[PDB]
């Protein structure tokens, strides 16, 4: 995030980190319940990547987090590689998340929900800070 | 480098499709929602993340980090997958597995 501020540990409990075998972080994701993760389609997740819930400081010899395994991936059939439209994927967990105090799910909107322009929202992640 | 070790966050305004289009024009498809250009920006490593908005006291998933300025420009609207639109599929997918 460019121009963001460091967050308070455990305050965005739904936020996970998708990493590779070597532990390399390539995309964020959100917890929607103990067995499902919602992420972007272009992240190209695969059954061999890992979901990591519980973190905050990626640079910690060892913390108290969960490494979950990917049961199954579902890219949405309508995703357009060229237009980037319908960029979504669901990851089904092999092992459910133990919800905790640092591990919760986010609420899902209703199809008719209306979010007004000018409203203030938030976004979080571990993405470049400078370009 | 510029790869934070510690989770980050930012507060930003949702844009209306119209005002988004003033920048990205037709590139703005239907299952897309814009926000930002307020002085912050999502950037490399942020995709798949979340964009939350307070609904009735609770944190709701409004969009998913998608793409934008090829440079993480802060004067430029960022675009995300608009959950509202993608929702049913989600539901159904969930429901069937």
């Amino acid at each position: 995030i460019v121009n963001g501020e460091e967050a308070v540990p455990g305050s965005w409990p739904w936020q996970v980190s998708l990493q590779d075998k070597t532990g390399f972080h390539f995309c964020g994701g959100s917890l929607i319940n103990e067995n499902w993760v919602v992420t972007a389609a272009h992240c190209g997740v695969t059954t061999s990547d890992v979901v990591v819930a519980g973190e905050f400081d990626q640079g910690s010899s060892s913390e108290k987090i969960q490494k979950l395994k990917i049961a199954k991936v579902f890219k949405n059939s309508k995703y357009n590689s060229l237009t980037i439209n319908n960029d979504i994927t669901l990851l089904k967990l092999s092992t459910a998340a133990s919800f905790s105090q640092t591990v919760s799910a986010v609420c899902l909107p209703s199809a008719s929900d209306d979010f007004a322009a000018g409203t203030t929202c938030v976004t979080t992640g571990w993405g470049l800070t400078r370009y | 480098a510029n790869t934070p070790d510690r989770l980050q966050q930012a507060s930003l305004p949702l844009l209306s499709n119209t005002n988004c289009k003033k920048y990205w024009g037709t590139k703005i498809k239907d299952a897309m929602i814009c926000a930002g250009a307020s002085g912050v920006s999502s950037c490399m490593g942020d995709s798949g993340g979340p964009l939350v908005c307070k609904k009735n006291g609770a944190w709701t998933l409004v969009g998913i980090v998608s793409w934008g300025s090829s440079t993480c420009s802060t004067s430029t609207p960022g675009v995300y997958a608009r959950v509202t639109a993608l929702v049913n599929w989600v539901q159904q997918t969930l429901a069937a597995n």
Binding site: E5, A7, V8, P9, G10, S11, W12, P13, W14, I32, S100, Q101, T102, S104, A105, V106, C107, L108, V122, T124 | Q9, A10, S11, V52, K55, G57, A58, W59, T60
Partner: peptide, 11 residues
């Protein structure tokens, strides 16, 4: 959902 144990701050 959407109610963290630990309240986030500023944002």
């Amino acid at each position: 959902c959407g109610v963290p144990a630990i309240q986030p701050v500023l944002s």
